Scaffold this active site. Structure first.
Site, mmCIF file in Angstrom:
data_model
loop_
_atom_site.group_PDB
_atom_site.id
_atom_site.type_symbol
_atom_site.label_atom_id
_atom_site.label_comp_id
_atom_site.label_asym_id
_atom_site.label_seq_id
_atom_site.Cartn_x
_atom_site.Cartn_y
_atom_site.Cartn_z
ATOM 1 C CG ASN A 9 37.126 59.628 66.064
ATOM 2 O OD1 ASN A 9 36.826 58.611 65.616
ATOM 3 N ND2 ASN A 9 38.326 60.264 65.948
ATOM 4 C CB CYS A 14 40.561 57.561 60.255
ATOM 5 S SG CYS A 14 41.404 56.422 61.130
ATOM 6 C CG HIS A 253 42.676 64.393 66.465
ATOM 7 N ND1 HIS A 253 41.464 63.824 66.111
ATOM 8 C CD2 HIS A 253 42.208 65.143 67.514
ATOM 9 C CE1 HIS A 253 40.182 64.416 66.649
ATOM 10 N NE2 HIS A 253 40.517 65.196 67.501
ATOM 11 C CG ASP A 270 38.584 67.544 67.199
ATOM 12 O OD1 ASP A 270 38.444 66.516 66.802
ATOM 13 O OD2 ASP A 270 39.068 67.983 68.171
#
Length: 662
Positions: A9, A14, A253, A270
């Site tokens: 990330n 996003c 998140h 994730d």
């Protein structure tokens, strides 16, 4: 071996990460992406090549995959360039892009094949016979969630026929205004169905940006057979859930749940960590319940999934890509190596006493005007080594030089300060700099006139001597003169230094002198008793302290600036500011000299003399600071000062105020 790989990330990328994985595991699409002829394309501006690169590395990398060149590629780099757009916009960006790059190839028409569905928007009159239809092609469906419980209800709502009644009548051409129905009906549903949930919308009168966390259900297996016009045996509209995209909590998140194989074995992606999860963690746990919540779902047609999720191996990737991308990786490896070399060295900026000569302001010199002799030096190399390097390069004996590092002080004055070569000689340059990224050091040398002869820099007792800098102020010319530096014992009485001050100034011995400590800008404290030691005379005595002296004479009084005190005061207030006409856009403006302690009346009065005009016919505007352009209007009973107005301007940044006439 080690399961699936994640993305990194990077900043405010996003939902982009979530979306990439979802496309990557649409295997039919991926194999077609590998076929795109990109060998002639630009490395960092080809979106097809960038997306190919991400897929290749998602398939091969042991390390999380970067989107460094991809974000650059489609032109959304800044933190909110994403926040501007929604996910579905990004989906159409990437899909349209690859779709058109496959035209002229063997895998042309893959994107309509996978994502295009057909729907009718129709209107039909009650009393009269008139119909108006519109055949539309969609790459996704937007489903409403407020007021709803499950996606079945949002589909009931989406097909719902609308009634055109009194005061909403439909004008059907020649017939005119009549009562009518307006309906939406799906003709086809594609192999890959993208459903965006309306979790949040830019609905003002409630909030420009928002979130709806209300409970909203979606099934593992979705039957759509009833929401289609046509059904056919052996090809029902039964859909298997493939992906679930999620947000939590301002932004928040983003995370995604996929069962890549279509076999109900789900994983939580994730960003950089992927893990296995239950079906509950993918579906049940992301319904709402008031936190974390599902905003976009991806289903695949039960018949088509064997095709859509074709097995993919290394071979499906051309050697044209393999070799190209692998060379890119070698390049990046060099770049990483270069960068880590550059991180090992630091920059030492040497300044000499000549640079101090002629400076008219506070402190040794002007930061923007000073001229340095710069050295690249190993951060972990020794002081003694640098001293030899300096002496060799500069052309001096080591015993005829001394280093005094420029130390920025608590009150915002930067000055030379002591380094003990004796004790600190063995330490690293970087530790001796306390990690000042570019090291600034004052280089004391012997007077070169004496260098030829027997002349070494004298001993400096780091406990009992101090190095002071001397400045002579002349009221007549209103000017400063650098009068060099001196070593002195701290116990020396100020009086005992007066002869040398006189001499450097070219004054007559026993000339009566006013002395000041130049402490800080606008702080110029008079040394009132000459008969006390330097220690008592100055406050907080220190190497690099400065004494400013001038002749004590009646003639001073006839000058505009009789004292060095007044000189420095004036230097601190005198400010040049640019005035820009708000009504003339791209006006560069005109500069005026003012005082930071001027009130509104004085500022306006002064600018009005310059513009031929009446001050009452000037409207000024407050600064928005770091943001460019005029702000709120400046009221004529504004209580503060020009200082108070200009405080949002950065130091190096020049000052400007906007105005208009009346």
């Amino acid at each position: 071996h080690t399961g699936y790989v994640g993305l990194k990330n990077q900043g405010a990328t996003c939902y982009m990460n979530s979306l990439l994985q979802t496309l990557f595991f649409t295997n039919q699409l991926r194999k077609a992406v590998y076929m795109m002829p990109t060998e002639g394309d630009d490395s960092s501006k080809s979106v097809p090549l960038a997306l190919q690169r991400v897929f290749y590395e998602l398939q091969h990398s042991d390390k999380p995959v970067g989107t460094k060149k991809l974000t650059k590629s489609f032109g959304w780099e800044t933190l909110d360039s994403f926040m501007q757009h929604d996910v579905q916009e990004l989906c159409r960006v990437l899909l349209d892009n690859v779709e058109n790059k496959m035209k002229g190839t063997c895998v042309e028409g893959t994107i309509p094949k996978l994502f295009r569905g057909k729907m009718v928007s129709y209107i039909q009159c009650k009393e009269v016979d008139y119909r108006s239809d519109r055949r539309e092609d969609y790459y996704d469906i937007q489903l409403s969630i407020k007021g709803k419980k499950n996606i079945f209800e949002s589909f009931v709502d989406y097909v719902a026929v609308e009634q055109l009644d009194g005061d909403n009548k439909y004008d059907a051409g020649e017939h005119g205004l009549q009562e009518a129905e307006k309906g939406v009906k799906f003709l086809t549903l594609p192999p890959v169905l993208h459903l965006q949930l309306m979790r949040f919308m830019y609905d003002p009168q409630t909030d420009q940006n928002i979130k709806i966390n209300d409970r909203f259900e979606f099934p593992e297996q979705l039957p759509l057979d009833e929401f289609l016009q046509k059904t056919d045996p052996k090809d029902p509209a039964n859909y298997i859930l493939h992906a679930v995209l999620v947000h939590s909590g301002h932004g928040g998140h983003y995370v995604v749940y996929l069962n890549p194989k279509g076999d109900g074995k789900w994983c939580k992606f994730d960003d950089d960590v992927v893990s296995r999860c239950t079906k509950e963690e993918a579906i049940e746990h992301n319904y709402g319940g008031h936190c974390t919540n599902a905003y976009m779902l991806v289903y695949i047609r039960e018949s088509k999934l064997s095709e859509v999720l074709q097995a993919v191996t290394d071979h499906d990737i051309p050697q044209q890509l393999v070799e190209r991308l692998q060379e890119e990786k070698r390049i990046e490896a060099q770049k990483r190596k270069e960068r880590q070399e550059a991180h090992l060295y630091m920059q030492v900026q040497i300044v000499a006493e000549d640079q101090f000569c002629g400076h008219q302001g506070n402190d040794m010199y002007d930061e923007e005007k000073v001229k340095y002799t710069v050295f690249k030096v190993l951060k972990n190399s020794s002081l003694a080594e640098f001293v030899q390097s300096l002496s060799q390069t500069m052309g001096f004996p080591q015993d005829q030089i001394r280093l005094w590092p420029m130390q920025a002080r608590s009150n915002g004055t930067k000055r030379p300060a002591m380094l003990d070569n004796e004790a600190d000689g063995n330490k690293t340059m970087i530790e001796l700099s306390d990690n000042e990224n570019p090291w600034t050091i004052f280089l004391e040398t012997v007077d070169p006139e004496l260098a030829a002869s027997g002349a070494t820099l004298p001993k400096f007792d780091k406990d009992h001597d101090v190095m002071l800098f001397l400045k002579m102020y002349d009221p007549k010319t209103r000017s400063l003169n650098y009068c060099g530096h001196i070593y002195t014992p701290i116990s020396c009485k100020i009086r005992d230094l007066l002869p040398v001050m006189c001499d450097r100034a070219g004054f007559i011995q026993d000339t009566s002198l006013i002395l000041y400590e130049e402490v800080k800008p606008n702080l110029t404290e008079r040394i009132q008793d000459y008969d006390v030691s330097l220690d008592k005379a100055l406050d907080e005595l220190m190497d690099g302290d400065i004494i400013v002296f001038q002749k004590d004479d009646p003639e001073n009084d006839n000058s505009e600036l009789p004292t060095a005190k007044e000189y420095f005061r004036d230097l601190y207030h005198r400010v040049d500011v640019i005035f820009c006409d708000k009504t003339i856009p791209n006006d560069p403006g005109f500069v005026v000299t003012l005082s930071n302690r001027m009130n509104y009346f004085q500022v306006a009065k002064t600018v009005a003399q310059r513009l031929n005009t009446d001050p009452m016919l000037l409207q000024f505007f407050k600064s928005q600071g770091y943001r460019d352009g005029p702000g709120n209007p400046l009221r004529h009973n504004y209580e503060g000062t020009l200082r108070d107005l200009l405080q949002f301007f950065k130091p190096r940044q020049p000052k400007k105020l906007y105005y208009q006439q009346l």
